Design a protein around this ligand. Sequence first.
Ligand SMILES: [Ca+2]
Ligand SMILES: [Ca+2]
Ligand SMILES: [Ca+2]
Length: 223
Amino acid sequence: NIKKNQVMNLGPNSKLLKEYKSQLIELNIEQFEAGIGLILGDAYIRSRDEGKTYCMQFEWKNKAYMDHVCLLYDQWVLSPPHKKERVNHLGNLVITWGAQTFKHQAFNKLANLFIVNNKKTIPNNLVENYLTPMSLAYWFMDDGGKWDYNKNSTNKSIVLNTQSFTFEEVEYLVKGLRNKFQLNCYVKINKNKPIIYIDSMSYLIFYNLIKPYLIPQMMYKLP
DNA sequence: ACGCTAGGGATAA
DNA sequence: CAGGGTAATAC
DNA sequence: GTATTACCCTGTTATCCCTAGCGT
Ligand SMILES: [Ca+2]
Ligand SMILES: [Ca+2]
Ligand SMILES: [Ca+2]
C-alpha cells in the first residue's frame, strides 16, 4: 500500500496520488466529530465539482493550533502549513498560516450534515444528533471566547461568535445546546448579529465537556 | 468610584 | 472564511 | 490540446477582543 510519504510531493494529478487517495475510505471518529466544530467554527469545507468530493481549507493566526489540526487530519494533509503575509489597506503587515486537505468523498459525510433542501445551512437537529463534546471543544477553540474581558473580572460567562449565521439558525443551535448539554444559554446581539451567550452558571459544566480536547495555547480563552 | 454592557475596530478569519 | 488561479501529470 | 487538482493567492469582513461610559 502507498505510503503518504511516497506522494506528498507529486503533482495534484499524479497516478500514485490518486491510488493513495483510493486507499482511504472515510474519516475516523475524531476527524469527523472535530470536523463538526471546525465547520461551525473557522474551517471551510468546499466542493469544486457538484458535490462528488470535498476538501477542507484552514487558516488561523495561531500556528500551534494550526499544527494540532493538521496533525489531526494527518493522512488528509500532504503539506505543512504555509505562512501567509499580507498588507492591509492601512499598510499593516498581517501574518497568518494556511493549509488544507485534498478533496475526497470521505469528506462528503461532514458536508452533507450542513446541507438541507440543497443549500448550506444549519439543520434544526444538528446539535442533538451530531455535536459531541469534542465537536463542542473545537467550536469553542474556533469561535469561543469570554463574555467579560475586563481586567480582574469574576464573571464566568462564555460566548460563541455565531455572527455568520442567521438568528433562526442560532436559535436552533441554542435549543440543541440547552436540551442536550443542559446548558443555560441564549442568543444575544453584537453588531446586530447572532452570538451565543452561556451564563457563568453553567461554566463548570461547559468546561468539563471540552477540557479533554483543548490545548494549552487556547486555555487563555477561558475565564 | 466601579462592575458590566453594547459599541466598535484592525484584524484573523 | 470564501472562491479563484495555475504549475504539475496524464493521455 | 484538454482534463485534473493541491497549493497557494486575493476579496472582504464578521470576528473575537477592548473599552468608553451607563447605571447604581
Ligand atoms: Ca469564526
Ligand atoms: Ca478563531
Ligand atoms: Ca468571517
